[PDB]
Amino acid sequence: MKRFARKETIYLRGEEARTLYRLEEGLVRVVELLPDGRLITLRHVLPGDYFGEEALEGKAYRYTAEAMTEAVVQGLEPRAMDHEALHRVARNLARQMRRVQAYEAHLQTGELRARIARYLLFLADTPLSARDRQGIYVTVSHEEIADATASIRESVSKVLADLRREGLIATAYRRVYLLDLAALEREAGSALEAA
Amino acid sequence: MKRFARKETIYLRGEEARTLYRLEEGLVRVVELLPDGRLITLRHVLPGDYFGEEALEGKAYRYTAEAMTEAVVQGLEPRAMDHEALHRVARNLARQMRRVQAYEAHLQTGELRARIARYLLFLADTPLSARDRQGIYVTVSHEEIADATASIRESVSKVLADLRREGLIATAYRRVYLLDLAALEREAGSALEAA
Numbered sequence A, B: 001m002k003r004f005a006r007k008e009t010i011y012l013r014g015e016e017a018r019t020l021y022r023l024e025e026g027l028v029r030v031v032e033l034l035p036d037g038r039l040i041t042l043r044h045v046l047p048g049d050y051f052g053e054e055a056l057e058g059k060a061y062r063y064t065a066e067a068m069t070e071a072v073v074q075g076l077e078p079r080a081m082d083h084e085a086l087h088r089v090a091r092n093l094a095r096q097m098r099r100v101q102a103y104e105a106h107l108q109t110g111e112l113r114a115r116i117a118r119y120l121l122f123l124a125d126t127p128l129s130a131r132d133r134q135g136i137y138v139t140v141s142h143e144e145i146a147d148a149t150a151s152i153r154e155s156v157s158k159v160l161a162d163l164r165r166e167g168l169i170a171t172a173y174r175r176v177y178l179l180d181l182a183a184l185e186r187e188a189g190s191a192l193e194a195a
Helices: A081-105 A112-123 A142-147 A154-167 A181-188 B082-109 B112-122 B142-147 B153-166 B181-189
Strands: A003-005 A010-011 A020-023 A028-033 A039-045 A064-067 A071-076 A129-132 A135-139 A169-173 A175-178 B003-004 B009-011 B020-025 B028-033 B039-045 B064-067 B073-078 B129-132 B135-140 B170-172 B175-178
Touching: A010 A154, A028 A142, A028 B181, A039 A081, A039 A142, A081 A112, A081 B039, A081 B082, A112 A142, A112 A154, A112 A175, A112 A181, A112 B181, A142 A154, A154 A169, B028 B142, B039 B082, B039 B135, B039 B142, B082 B112, B112 B142, B112 B153, B112 B175, B112 B181, B142 B153
Parallel strands: none
Antiparallel strands: A003 A071, A010 A064, A020 A071, A028 A039, A028 A064, A129 A135, A135 A175, A169 A175, B003 B073, B009 B064, B020 B073, B028 B039, B028 B064, B129 B135, B135 B175, B170 B175
């Protein structure tokens, strides 16, 4: 077991894939740095999910895994898993395949405004969410939203300003408060697979 | 074992996921029909790949699987797999996860022209490819290219017309001949994971 702080990486693209990991607590994003400098979120790893999947098939990781919150991960030796462990891995990888394909569709469904609303609602069901008197909120940056909505930070910031002005969200202390869930749901249209 | 003809579906979104499948021959695409009528290719299933993955985790398929060529598939009972089978499934799902994330990145890397060149080169390494005197070719429609390049058919057709005029490709009998591989590689920039 090993703990990681927000923004620390669990593994990097191109490095030896000797270890398979299972996320115990927190939220991890698998990302790719594009030719033009853009960082793109490929998928979200949630508690219970196996990642560093390359350890099961290749020699090196193909992507980089970054903790989005304080995260607790368990390293595992692929070659030392029993029948029961393999069953859990197969079932969980199947669930992540369902989720990443849904995420893929989301990136191509609706204008930016709808994609942002959908992503915020998705995050509301992850370890990135919390609640207080002001309401439900998610701790995420404008850049991270851009990374998961096929857009750039400047465009995300503009839509967030619109949503603030309209009363759907509020921002404070690196958080995005979801003030009108019903309105956000309508903006997103279809929800994004949270489990 | 069961054989499917091009365009026939192996399973449909929302139907009971009682069966896990392994593609023996041919090429299958997993797709989603979007709200606005758009069909989107979520991933490519190649010989050896397990699909209908929902049978390992849920009660119903979440997407639709369509044969892109004559395809031979083997149905499997998830609950009847031994240690060796589970190992193969885990390893293969890990490989498909690597490939679908690379596909995801491709959809957001470069202008349409580069995305089309990249997709054509990817297909050149699948069962959709063949060769004759005119050269290497891939049997694919303009619509299928649009479905896998985050674009619409009209836009794909225009770029293909440009590529024909420039000599990079030629078209005939529902095929796209790749005449200048070097030029296409340069257009694509980065290659798309073929295995």
